[PDB]
């Protein structure tokens, strides 16, 4: 996160930390006790699928306080329409091997319904993005979780404000190279507040470099995937670690 502040411990209870072999890989969002939404591109070059870990309750990466929670990722589900190496349909549904135990520090983010999210949330101006990614383009990632409040644009206004952006995405952020999300933040939550409740509206995806002036952040439009997400969450687990499910 470039141009943000530290998320006070506990105020980003749904944020997830994805690790490969112990290494920081990506961020993700907890939407239930066994389900984590992330970003497809985070798995394009995955090393050993049998070393994928999700960490809930994490805050400061240099200290263990007992609130952290570790679970093995049992399955990573990706829409059929996703093309590795590209950016459209950048969404992934992870199934934890065992459930996280909800506590004051581990809480799921509401996955809203299609209608509510398209005609009401999609219009809330400011939302939050978080992750332990780079604090500057070509800079070092963060030790403490970062959060940044960014403004969502209209697909039309985004294109023009820049002289590649499907309807499965939406822009948000700022063009003055001062605020944005970076690599390390991919797969993290774009969360919207409405009537006393946060909901998942975007997934940190790609974007021309990090905090690149003249550019906005691109986030996967979650709303285009609620039904996909739900059908899978209500299905029975099929063998295999990496699975591609049809989309729509």
């Amino acid at each position: 996160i470039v141009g943000g502040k530290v998320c006070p411990k506990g105020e980003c209870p749904w944020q997830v930390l994805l690790l490969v072999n112990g290494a920081q890989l990506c961020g993700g969002t907890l939407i239930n006790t066994i389900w984590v939404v992330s970003a497809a591109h985070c798995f394009d070059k995955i090393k050993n699928w049998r070393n994928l870990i999700a960490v809930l309750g994490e805050h400061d990466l240099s200290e263990h306080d007992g609130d952290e929670q570790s679970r093995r990722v049992a399955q990573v589900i990706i829409p059929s329409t996703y093309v590795p190496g590209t950016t459209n349909h950048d969404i992934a549904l992870l199934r934890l091997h065992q459930p996280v135990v909800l506590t004051d520090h581990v809480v799921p983010l509401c996955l809203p319904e299609r209608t509510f999210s398209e005609r009401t949330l999609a219009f809330v101006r400011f939302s939050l993005v978080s992750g332990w990614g780079q604090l500057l383009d070509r800079g070092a990632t963060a030790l403490e979780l970062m959060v940044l409040n960014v403004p969502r644009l209209m697909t039309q206004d985004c294109l023009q404000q820049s002289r590649n952006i499907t309807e499965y995405m939406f822009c948000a952020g700022y063009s003055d190279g001062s605020k944005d999300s970076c690599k390390g933040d991919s797969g993290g939550p774009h969360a919207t507040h409405y009537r006393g409740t946060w909901y998942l509206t975007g997934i940190v995806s790609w974007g021309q470099g990090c905090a690149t002036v003249g550019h906005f952040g691109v986030y996967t439009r979650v709303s285009q995937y609620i039904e996909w997400l739900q059908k899978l969450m209500r299905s029975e687990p099929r063998p295999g670690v990496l699975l591609r499910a049809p989309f729509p």
Binding site: K9, W14, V107, L109, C110, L111, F116, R195
Partner: protein
């Protein structure tokens, strides 16, 4: 009535039937108040609620 405008006054989800007939709902872990629009938590950690801020 139809709940397309202002979320039909629902705290969370709503859906409008026939004409003038609408119904607000809540995400799991919540229940709809007698009020008709408000959702109140039914479990210890409802989605989208931040315990440290909630508990004040």
């Amino acid at each position: 009535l139809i709940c397309v405008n202002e979320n039909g006054g629902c705290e969370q989800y709503c859906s409008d039937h026939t004409g003038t007939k609408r119904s607000c709902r809540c995400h799991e872990g919540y229940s709809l108040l007698a009020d008709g629009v408000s959702c109140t938590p039914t479990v210890e950690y409802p989605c989208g609620k931040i315990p440290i801020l909630e508990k004040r």
